[PDB]
């Protein structure tokens, strides 16, 4: 068919996909827009060859690349922050300067986590700790992955957590809800302020965490390395414990790649970041609400680039993201 069917997942969504559809009508090859429920339904429908593309960050591209479906990236955006990189950012640990402790010693610190099921503050620490058999983790006949790290850590702050006391222990507020999902610690900021008030001796973040909360105090942290260094917070390239991709579309590996390409190649050139146009690919940022931001691409993508042929989900995430999310099952 000389036509993509794009999948969106709520109605503000839906509509500017068929603006995009109403402005490229007249072209060869066509859009449409198939509405599902959420974005793992959208996955089946590309799958059962009832839809063909949708724009997916890191951890659900990953599950759209797992057997039954094996959908593969195919062109992923590009933002300002990580210079024309396929990147969205790096997930650092971040320590005050002056301890001494490496990640060897890390087993009975105290930690502050963004919150339970998080990617930067959750899985791929924890994930990373497990691949790496620091933590015990066989699987969830267990329990919890949540019992596993509290024989590790020796308290933590996880906004979230509900099987273990330990891992609300570190957190700030009052008992009632001091580990709600939305308490003080929880976040990018609030696992950093964990970290400043001396709550926890760790904070799992991303790279732009100390920048964009104390870009005047830089001086007083730093970042602990996999491989037993310490090193200055804007070494982050060379001491993260995983890069986490760019959002990606994600389609059938089969003939229908060059339309999808072809489509949004001459999309992005006539609606993209410097469109005259009325409508935008790419945002324009600044959207407030939620249900309005990120809609088909993210606000702050600046183009989108083709992915290499040979690139499947494992290739595209990278073996240090991947392992991480891959021992969290």
């Known amino acids: 068919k000389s036509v993509i069917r794009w999948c ?9 996909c068929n603006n995009l ?12 827009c198939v509405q599902k429920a959420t974005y793992l339904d959208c996955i089946k429908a590309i799958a059962n060859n009832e839809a063909d593309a949708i724009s997916l960050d890191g951890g659900q591209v990953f599950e759209a690349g797992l057997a039954p479906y094996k959908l593969k990236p195919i062109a992923a955006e590009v933002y300002e922050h990580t210079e024309g990189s396929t990147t969205s950012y790096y997930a650092v640990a971040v320590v005050k300067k002056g301890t001494e402790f490496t990640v060897n010693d890390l087993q009975g610190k105290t930690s502050c986590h963004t919150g339970l099921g998080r990617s930067a503050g959750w899985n791929i620490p924890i994930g990373t ?17 949540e019992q596993a790290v509290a024989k590790f ?13 330990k891992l609300c222990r570190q957190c700030k507020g009052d008992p009632k809800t001091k580990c709600a999902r939305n308490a003080p610690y929880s976040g990018y900021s609030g696992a950093f302020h964990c970290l400043k008030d001396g709550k926890g001796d760790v904070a799992f973040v991303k790279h732009t965490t100390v920048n964009e909360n104390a870009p005047d105090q830089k001086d007083e942290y730093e970042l ?3 491989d037993g260094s310490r090193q ?48 935008h ?21 600046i183009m989108l680039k083709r992915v290499p042929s ?8 990278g073996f240090e993201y991947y392992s991480a999310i891959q021992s969290m099952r």
Not at 21 to 32: G, P, V
Not at 153 to 159: D, E, G, N, R
Not at 247 to 256: L, S, W
């Open 232 to 279: 200055p917070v804007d070494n982050y390239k060379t001491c993260n414990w995983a890069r986490v991709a760019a959002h990606a579309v994600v389609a059938r590996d089969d003939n229908k790649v060059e339309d999808i390409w072809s489509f949004l190649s001459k999309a992005q050139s006539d609606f993209g970041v410097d469109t005259k146009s009325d409508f």
């Open 8 to 16: 969106t997942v709520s109605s503000p969504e839906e509509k500017k």
């Open 224 to 226: 602990l390395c996999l």
């Open 281 to 301: 690919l790419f945002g324009p940022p600044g959207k407030k609400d939620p249900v309005l931001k990120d809609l088909l691409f993210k606000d702050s993508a």
């Open 310 to 317: 040979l690139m499947d989900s494992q290739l595209y995430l």
């Open 153 to 165: 850590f020796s308290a933590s702050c996880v906004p979230g957590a509900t099987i273990e006391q």
């Open 129 to 145: 700790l497990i691949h790496r058999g620091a933590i015990e983790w066989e699987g969830i006949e267990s329990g919890s992955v």
């Open 21 to 32: 559809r109403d402005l490229t009508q007249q072209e060869r090859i066509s859009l449409t």
